[model samples]
Target: KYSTVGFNIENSYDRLMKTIKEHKLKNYIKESVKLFNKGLTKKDNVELKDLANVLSFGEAKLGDNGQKFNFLFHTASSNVWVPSIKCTSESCESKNHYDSSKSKTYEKDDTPVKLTSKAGTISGIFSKDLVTIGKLSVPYKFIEMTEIVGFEPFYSESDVDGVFGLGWKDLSIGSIDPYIVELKTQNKIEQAVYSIYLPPENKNKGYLTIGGIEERFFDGPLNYEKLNHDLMWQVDLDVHFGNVSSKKANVILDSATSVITVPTEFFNQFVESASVFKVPFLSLYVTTCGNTKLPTLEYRSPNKVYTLEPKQYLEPLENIFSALCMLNIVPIDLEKNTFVLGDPFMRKYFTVYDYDNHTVGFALAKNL
Candidate 1:
């Protein structure tokens, strides 16, 4: 009872334009596509954590007498980090920096470490302190970044202060335990698992349930598949998207990614099946914003087939010049048969991450 905490999450597509003064729609899509290309290069596990876009962010408090702030809930990597007061980078100037001087319960570790991803690299020292999400609080070790390099305009426009990692310890830079694992070891939480429920972009409402799965968030029974590996929340599935199909595809469920990524082999057939036109020069697809029919995408495990409707897969962008919808799926060859299902798919299906059991569960979310 003490360990479980629920908090609100807001996706960047619906939230980030407040900080930008230029053409919001055009600029946002431009940056999103740029980041997507950056994320595609780092296919290996060690450097793949930094994804293209932060799909959603959740509020959490860190340190003694906690500092209330928002953090990106990252599932591909594990190791909490926040900007330190010592950081002089322009990226850190506008963000919420952690002050060890102000935290009454802060403990000094000062072990230097460098974290790298395709988007950027951050150098920091390890520090121990209390972290609070909702009512639950625990003494945890995290990073105090002294230097943040790269990730330019993306991080500059982001509203979050830091990253709250949710992947396995293997993915951590220094083999540090994730917050959920720490909670389970301390017996603070009933279970080493969490579930997420994301509403549509327009609704602007969602839930991140840590320590236990909340059945009320979804209807029908949850279908589960054992993880293919312990490094990330990755699973093997049969992906059927439009006219293309793959038997036993390598798929990772990433909350930080704003779109779905299909393998290069399926790209042309999928576009043809959906009747979406590719934009010139840019690696993007578009469709009319009217009542046009589109194909449903499906992911099948041994037990059940999870489906995503056309409305769930398309992101509508409204501008004064024109009204069109962007196809929220990208085509990149991470590995031979790898696919990435990001926020668009998660928005339609309630997802559960069970660390103790090493399984991922999926079910249709209630209230759309």
Candidate 2:
């Protein structure tokens, strides 16, 4: 089944990038660059002097094409290092051998068995208790290293161990209720947790988990439905097509993905009819261009449209001297609903993922 939710357009990935460029102190970007250059080091075993000058986070893995890194961070309280399976580049082989003549346990077998390393899992107590925003503590079992593309010099001396999910599921924290209500009604305070999943890298190192949220605010706790995935949720969204007609669909709640992507055909139609300038479409291109300002089309009902100008929805950037468009044009069947609800949409709401109950919850948050 599908769900419905509302989102405000306040923060965008483009804006975040602009802020980094403007400040010249992007922790996420700098850290990602370091990891790409130097492979990851073992936890708590490196020198602090080795990391005196680092900045920026890494790029989020675009899609499942296997070209990006997948990072996950969790606490030691969750689970320890589970055994991993090995696979060859072209074939799958089993390394476990049984000999009735030998001892009952495989470790006692006389013949030695060699297992190639395809992937390894690491667990730890989170270093920092929060991100850039004063949310909550980070998870322990973070960073899932995937296959590396090729050897690069950037990975030469990466400091951090691995990446973690900073997306909607893992990064958000719940809000505090009014003291009057808590004292008289016995309302309880709920804990909020969020995570970031990085794509796999070869020399895995140099990743940072900053504590707290950045600027460009939007107050939230929009409507949403929690899904089955431990921390995942489905948001009910309404998108304006041409002529003021809008389509309702569900977007996978993710904080790592930078853009809101719909199918190709639907994107084209929305742009053409909504007065949004259609640029050469690339799967991973930035949403805003050097020129061609657009407007934010309003949705009156299911099939109504209202024309708007770019200034109504644009936010200025640093390196790029232009206003970035807050709304996105994604193509979807509305009929066969399937798409991702990325970071841009989420920054608008205060999100919570309840893994214990297998559902995600959202509510309006106080804009700080």
What TM-score does each of the candidates earn?
Answer: 0.82, 0.40
Model 2: weakest 10-residue lDDT segment is: 126-135
Off by over 4 Å in 2: 1-160, 165-224, 228-231, 235-248, 279-336
Model 1: clashing residue pairs? none
For model 2, how does the per-residue alpha-carbon lDDT over 1-368 read when each residue is reduced to its tens digit?
01111111222344445455686744543343344225342120221122112222223221122122212322211211111122221111121111222322212112212222223222212111111111211112211222222212222233222233222222212221111112122312232232222211211122222221211222332333545343335544455433433355554555333435455565555455332332222111222433353445432223322223343233333233233233433343423554554433333344444333344444433333
Alpha-carbon local distance difference test for all models: 0.73, 0.30
- TM-score for candidate 2, residues paired by index: 0.40
User: CA RMSD for every model?
Assistant: 6.7, 17.1
Clashes per model (N, Cα, C within 3 A): 0, 81
Q: Taking the tens digit of each residue's C-alpha lDDT, what string does model 1 give over 1-368?
A: 32334434444444433423343446655454444334432221112333355534455777877776667767766788889989978889888888888999999988898878777999988988898886667888888889999877667877877888888743335667788888888887888888877765443555678887777778888888899987778898899976679999988987666678887669767776354655444444666556355778888888788888878877776641144577777777788898888888888888999988999999888874
Q: Deviation in angstroms for 147 in model 2?
A: 7.9
The true-versus-predicted C-alpha distance at residue 228 of model 2, in Å, is 6.1
**Model 1, which residues run further than 4 Å from truth?**
1-51, 55-58, 169-174, 201-203, 281-283, 288-293, 317-324
